[PDB]
Symmetry: D2
Subunit: 31 residues, 4 copies
């Protein structure tokens, strides 16, 4: 549970940031 | 630069983990 | 302007399939 | 397997395009 991950790239973060927020919303909307 | 990103999930993390390692490889092939 | 992309792989396509469905549902929330 | 997906997003497509080319390059080195 919970796996910290650091990346030297703000660009990749923006991507993973959208995938993380988009993946969490699917669970709340889908259940 | 280094931006932390708490990823809770084996698949989700594996995604950003594979995307991070895959993105770094492109730099070697491209420049 | 549609850009057909022949995804080679069940996992690869499944990935973009989840990113496409999540990006489409997320866009509805914004505008 | 070869799947066919139609992406109506310039940015979204570029993502899967970079993810498919990056995931295909890493798979070639292993497989």
């Amino acid at each position: 549970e919970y796996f910290f991950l650091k990346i030297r790239g703000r660009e990749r973060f923006e991507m993973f940031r959208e995938l993380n927020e988009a993946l969490e919303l699917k669970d709340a909307q889908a259940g």
